[PDB]
Ligand SMILES: [Co+2]
């Protein structure tokens with residue numbers, strides 16, 4: 498059987514979709530520790546989102562499944578007679594799941610706390626992390642999109658997938674000839690809008706485009722949306738995720754009967770205050786829970802926020818430099834050889850990252866036996882599973898095959914980069930694998946990755962459903 502498996506993979510790797518592409522492929526039997534297959538396992542390649550694997554493991558080691566994040570509201574001293582206060586500070590400490598609901602819940606506490614007026618200014622404190630919003634080598638052209646959202650300690654998360662630093666932009670068609678109707682979602686009143694979009698005739702081509710011009714906090718909409726066209730929605734990042742959290746909290750307070758006479762702005766709690774009053778606070782779910790949405794949908798904001806949290810825990814510094822070193826350290830304490838590893842960021846978006854298929858499998862074996870093995874493997878996306886929170890970025894892959902609901906693996910794709918690394922649980926042996934492709938020029942070789950994952954699932958003792 499073994500010999501057949503090897504030949505089969507060699508054949509699959511013969512796909513023309515992998516021309517001019519270096520591919521690191523490693524397969525190992527977790528149980529026996531046997532090396533079922535290996536090709537360029539020591540070759541340094543860009544891992545794309547697969548990099549999140551290393552960040553996720555590091556997070557469990559340094560923060561732990563138990564870990565959770567907090568958000569506070571503080572005044573110099575509690576309110577009194579007329580229930581007034583001067584400056585109010587919204588302090589974020591890395592919660593990547595802070596919803597607008599959470600903010601409203603807090604706006605309520607501040608009110609129940611006896612506050613009716615914020616005579617001073619309302620400040621958003623995100624100093625828990627540095628202000629380095631984007632990784633040095635991230636392409637500025639990717640900035641308008643969610644996966645490239647600015648990183649901040651205080652940031653609001655959209656939806657149940659917790660997309661940070663973004664706002665939801667909607668474009669609804671009007672009558673042919675009339676301007677299209679644009680809604681900026683949360684960023685309303687915060688970001689500037691330049692709506693040049695127009696309703697085209699019914700049946701006309703949809704040429705609409707939503708964008709945030711680099712270096713601005715403006716949502717520019719151009720193009721034409723046909724009248725008979727279904728309203729469009731999109732996620733666009735904003736500048737200074739904190740200034741937005743402050744804006745929404747500003748609106749949350751007002752909604753909870755608390756007036757704010759000042760202005761919303763960035764700024765940390767004076768430190769001059771020996772006993773600031775904590776009018777309100779929120780605590781997120783534990784890391785083990787937050788891991789799911791992070792890994793299932795591959796959330797870059799979460800990965801980066803995690804690195805800096807690790808930087809805070811290991812060195813008291815929400816910095817990529819600190820966190821990254823902390824990640825590399827943690828991986829070592831886990832028994833992983835970080836020799837051919839190069840960490841430039843936590844999400845894998847950075848072209849500066851480098852790993853080797855061997856290192857990945859290495860991290861898979863170790864992680865597989867660590868105390869948090871369960872919560873860990875449970876965050877990985879499962880092959881061909883409709884439910885988004887289970888299938889993740891693999892919901893629409895390998896369906897109706899031996900891998901369906903069997904292969905647990907992290908995906909990762911960029912131009913010329915693609916990877917699929919994970920586990921293949923089975924009666925014929927517990928398998929760990931890694932596939933990293935760099936160099937291909939057409940689309941990502943996802944069918945090749947699947948083909949291999951499906952053959953492995955079979956080798957592990959699984960049959961396609963009928
Ligand atoms: Co902890």
Ligand SMILES: [Co+2]
Pocket residue numbers: 655656665
């Ligand atoms: Co949504």
Ligand SMILES: [Co+2]
Pocket residue numbers: 683684685686687744748
């Ligand atoms: Co608003």
Ligand SMILES: [Co+2]
Pocket residue numbers: 594595596599779780781782
């Ligand atoms: Co929460």
Ligand SMILES: [Co+2]
Pocket residue numbers: 899903958959960
């Ligand atoms: Co099966």
